[PDB]
Amino acid sequence: KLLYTSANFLGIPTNRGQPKIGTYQGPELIRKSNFFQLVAEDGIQLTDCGDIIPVELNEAEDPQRFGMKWSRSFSLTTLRIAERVEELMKQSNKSTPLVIVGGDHSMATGTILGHAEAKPDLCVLWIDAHGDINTPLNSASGNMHGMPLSFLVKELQDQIPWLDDFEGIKPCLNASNIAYIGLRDLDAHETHDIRKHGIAYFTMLDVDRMGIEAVIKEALLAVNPRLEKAIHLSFDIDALDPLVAPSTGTAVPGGLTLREGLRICEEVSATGKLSVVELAELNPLLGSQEDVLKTQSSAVHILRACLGHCRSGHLPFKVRNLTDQGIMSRAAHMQT
Amino acid sequence: KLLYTSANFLGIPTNRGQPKIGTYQGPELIRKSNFFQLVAEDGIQLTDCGDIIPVELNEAEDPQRFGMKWSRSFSLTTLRIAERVEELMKQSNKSTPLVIVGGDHSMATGTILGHAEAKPDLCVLWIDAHGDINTPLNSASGNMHGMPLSFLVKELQDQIPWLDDFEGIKPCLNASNIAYIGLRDLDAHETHDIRKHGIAYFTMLDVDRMGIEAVIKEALLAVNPRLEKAIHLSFDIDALDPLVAPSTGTAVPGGLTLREGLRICEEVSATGKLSVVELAELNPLLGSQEDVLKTQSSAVHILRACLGHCRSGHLPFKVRNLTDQGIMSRAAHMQT
Amino acid sequence: KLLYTSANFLGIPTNRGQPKIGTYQGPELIRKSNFFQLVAEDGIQLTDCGDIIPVELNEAEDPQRFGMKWSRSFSLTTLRIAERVEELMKQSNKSTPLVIVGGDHSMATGTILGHAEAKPDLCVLWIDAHGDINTPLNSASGNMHGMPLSFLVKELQDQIPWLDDFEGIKPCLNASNIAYIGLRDLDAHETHDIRKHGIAYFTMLDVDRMGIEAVIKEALLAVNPRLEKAIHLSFDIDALDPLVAPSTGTAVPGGLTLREGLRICEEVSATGKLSVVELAELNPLLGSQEDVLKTQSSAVHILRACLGHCRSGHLPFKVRNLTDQGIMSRAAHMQT
Ligand SMILES: N[C@@](CCCC[B-](O)(O)O)(C(=O)O)C1CCN(Cc2ccc(Cl)c(Cl)c2)CC1
Ligand SMILES: N[C@@](CCCC[B-](O)(O)O)(C(=O)O)C1CCN(Cc2ccc(Cl)c(Cl)c2)CC1
Ligand SMILES: N[C@@](CCCC[B-](O)(O)O)(C(=O)O)C1CCN(Cc2ccc(Cl)c(Cl)c2)CC1
Ligand SMILES: [Cl-]
Ligand SMILES: [Cl-]
Ligand SMILES: [Cl-]
Ligand SMILES: [Cs+]
Ligand SMILES: [Cs+]
Ligand SMILES: [Cs+]
Ligand SMILES: [Cs+]
Ligand SMILES: [Cs+]
Numbered sequence A, B, C: 001k002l003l004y005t006s007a008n009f010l011g012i013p014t015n016r017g018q019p020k021i022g023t024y025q026g027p028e029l030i031r032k033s034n035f036f037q038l039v040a041e042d043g044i045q046l047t048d049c050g051d052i053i054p055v056e057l058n059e060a061e062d063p064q065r066f067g068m069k070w071s072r073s074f075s076l077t078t079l080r081i082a083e084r085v086e087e088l089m090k091q092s093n094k095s096t097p098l099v100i101v102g103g104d105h106s107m108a109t110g111t112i113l114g115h116a117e118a119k120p121d122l123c124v125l126w127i128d129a130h131g132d133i134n135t136p137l138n139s140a141s142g143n144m145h146g147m148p149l150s151f152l153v154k155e156l157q158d159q160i161p162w163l164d165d166f167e168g169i170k171p172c173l174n175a176s177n178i179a180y181i182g183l184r185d186l187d188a189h190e191t192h193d194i195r196k197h198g199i200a201y202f203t204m205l206d207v208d209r210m211g212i213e214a215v216i217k218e219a220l221l222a223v224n225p226r227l228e229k230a231i232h233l234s235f236d237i238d239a240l241d242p243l244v245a246p247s248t249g250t251a252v253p254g255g256l257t258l259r260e261g262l263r264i265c266e267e268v269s270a271t272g273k274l275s276v277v278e279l280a281e282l283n284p285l286l287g288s289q290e291d292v293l294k295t296q297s298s299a300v301h302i303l304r305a306c307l308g309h310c311r312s313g314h315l316p317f318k319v320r321n322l323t324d325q326g327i328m329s330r331a332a333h334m335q336t
């Protein structure tokens, strides 16, 4: 009765991809929730594989290079993440989805790198208000969480500056393997690159005009037309409207409703090809206590959908019956 | 110009169906609002018929039986409610809708029981995040507000334990007479029963895929295909998204928008068959002061829609004209 | 690459159209935001033309007349506004949109009056929870922000009382030139007038049944069928749901989502006929600090859409390239 009967859970508390402290508490926000319990109530066996420890260098060891902040912390963390994800995905080779909770979105360079080592023909569905595809000299901020796809996309490599410590970060994605949903705050140079190299993208304007059901269908058709490929689902929590996920660093008004979010994850889950889902940019240090609780529960419902939770209900494993307990029913009594 | 020119209002402050104190203040939350005034501004004559007094036994008088909490308080309250609703509906036999404000949802066993005495061929539209159809041995909580339909549905009576004090609670509904809208947190055994006995149900997944306009149409077609039957509309306020109804005991993210809620009620009202509407699970003791105000106003707009309020406007009874007052208009002056 | 390369910005801090203090701070709420900066980042040259000073008489100078509150302050302010807007629109005669930030909605009588002097064949798109078309003897409140269209519509002039100081407020609109979107709280006499004189109107019920995409299309077809006419877009911030614009004086539940709001403005902008947009009823003195921030940002995104901001992204003016900076790319290095 289950598409996935087992899953792995992994925390990655990245916080050097952007300057607001708190994304390192993202994984704990989910472990504190009722997520594990709810997943078990649906019959799925979920193993907590712990946390990856990011490499966090001090300032002297990691000065700006090409405007990037903490780029050596990033290159070392990226390789450490990729190694771990690769090994998790190879022991898994019904499939066993890996659920990753961040951490700021700079982690995706590592998770996709490692994922692609185990499954080189994968596709990527990127759910985000933002493109996360700035090349370093175009980044207005220097924040690495705004650049993680640019290092992975083969077509962009003539706009990435060479750095020795980045050598092991091999571009493993073709522009044709990525589709965006949720965009509403692209930088001009992101827009240029996306359109030039033909990356499939469905912005909130597309969601408004097409509806989320057509958008999901067209995104899957664009990068996984016959469901042949493993799916890496990279879900930025700020893809969702600030009304349901306020506790995140770069919140943008006019986002996906929670329900639109669930629909993306439900459809992706139902392909049977969900290989990795990562959830980025939870920051429980942002907003009120009630803000944190809203963001937490949105995250939990999103992750549950990813593992196959069905809003139209699940059947019980064992169907209970009164007579087995030696109890007299109303129907039985009315008979006698 | 009005489908219903008169209506009755009844409070039922049930609070022994679930453990959070405060649902007993639900009716007063609405009497304190501008509801009565707004209904009068549309030309509808609304009579406040007061409150039913629930039977609330002490612990010694009402211990657990088959895991149910406060089950004798429930059986006695159910009969008291049914008697009152029956008598209100028979004096009413244009029709006169009865508007009931709860109170936790355990009251529905009584309201439907009494309603069905006056109108035995009725149908039920159940608007809820939850199924409220757990049979007692499957209930994980023992809370009666999670069980009220199970006692009414004929097909379920071989899974209801016999209790003498429940004898007068006669199953008056066929599975074929009920349709759900809004579901998103069914228990596994609810799912089993609903599907086994073919109860029409439209979950939030159906609402996402079909749209609320098709959902309403299909729900009405399923249980009232030619508008021959009286309608009992049982509206749990937690059917609506927590963003618009936060002050309720079992809030579930991803609910109906207020507008989707209004559309259900507008269509149900416009059939001319709305016989009873009850609004359950208001708890003004939950949430901030602003939470309570949001929940209150959502409830008021919902109830107004039920009585035929039209968002596209109403015509005046008397059309006013300047000349009657002996006043010179701009047009008149420009003439002379 | 731009439909409008220049725009003017004008504040009108009206506050005598309604009794809650604070709408006079509306323009400053927007000047304090990042609006100007964001508009510049899209390549649009925006000139701040300052504020109009409303005429605010004391009580003795301005007693009630025909139940209207502050009607002489209104007539004098209306003429002062109209003169200023006219002169701004004539120097502008690619077109140069005028962006007006209120101020309560009583200002529209003046802005449309002056606009129509420069462009007499204009059409009006009125985005509002309310009709703002009460004639003075039908107004239950006496608040002028609830009456501004009634003075402009030729067909209504036999229901406007003559007042000498109103003589210069010439009715410049035909009922056939106006379309509403967003209505959900019409007064009965508004409903009567709208239907009698055939004013196009699309309420939230129409938005629910038709969807905003069809609604926009039909509104534009009704009053600007071949895009021949200049458009006056009069956007009441309370058209939007209180969840995204809480800081306004007459908030009504069940409004446009922010996204629906953006879609209206995006389509209106894209006609190339957007001549004036005014944004009314911001009140930063209402609600919490976070309420004010939500309302502010909703306003900013709305105004940006009006000037042609594209949620699917903009192309850069200058495309940057690594080699120009004498930097070695990853691709280049891999070659050698
Ligand atoms: N793209 C961003 C955000 C990336 C967020 C990372 B995510 O939360 O993981 O999706 C990034 O940091 O790369 C910024 C960049 C700056 N824009 C506004 C902007 C645009 C153009 C100019 Cl010239 C300037 Cl000065 C500012 C907002 C998004
Ligand atoms: N169905 C509920 C809620 C009924 C709310 C009553 B209403 O607010 O009037 O609609 C009820 O109380 O009957 C609960 C039951 C427990 N589930 C979660 C759950 C599911 C399965 C298991 Cl095994 C466990 Cl331990 C927990 C949530 C809804
Ligand atoms: N139309 C209103 C609001 C206008 C708001 C101006 B806006 O914020 O610029 O759109 C205005 O002030 O003109 C009121 C009038 C009173 N109704 C409720 C009502 C209806 C009928 C009667 Cl008989 C009574 Cl006593 C009350 C709400 C909107
Ligand atoms: Cl597209
Ligand atoms: Cl169905
Ligand atoms: Cl219409
Ligand atoms: Cs826990
Ligand atoms: Cs696109
Ligand atoms: Cs905080
Ligand atoms: Cs009252
Ligand atoms: Cs179903």
Ligand SMILES: [Cs+]
Pocket: B285, B286, B287, B288
């Ligand atoms: Cs409280």
Ligand SMILES: [Cs+]
Pocket: C031, C032, C033, C034
């Ligand atoms: Cs500023």
Ligand SMILES: [Cs+]
Pocket: B312, C201, C202, C203, C206
């Ligand atoms: Cs209409």
Ligand SMILES: [Cs+]
Pocket: C285, C286, C287, C288
């Ligand atoms: Cs305040």
Ligand SMILES: [Mn+2]
Pocket: A128, A129, A130, A236, A238, A239, A250, A281
């Ligand atoms: Mn983002």
Ligand SMILES: [Mn+2]
Pocket: A105, A128, A130, A132, A145, A236, A280, A281
């Ligand atoms: Mn991101």
Ligand SMILES: [Mn+2]
Pocket: B128, B129, B130, B236, B238, B239, B250, B281
């Ligand atoms: Mn419920």
Ligand SMILES: [Mn+2]
Pocket: B105, B128, B130, B132, B145, B236, B280, B281
């Ligand atoms: Mn319920």
Ligand SMILES: [Mn+2]
Pocket: C128, C129, C130, C236, C238, C239, C250, C281
């Ligand atoms: Mn308004």
Ligand SMILES: [Mn+2]
Pocket: C105, C128, C130, C132, C145, C236, C280, C281
């Ligand atoms: Mn208005």
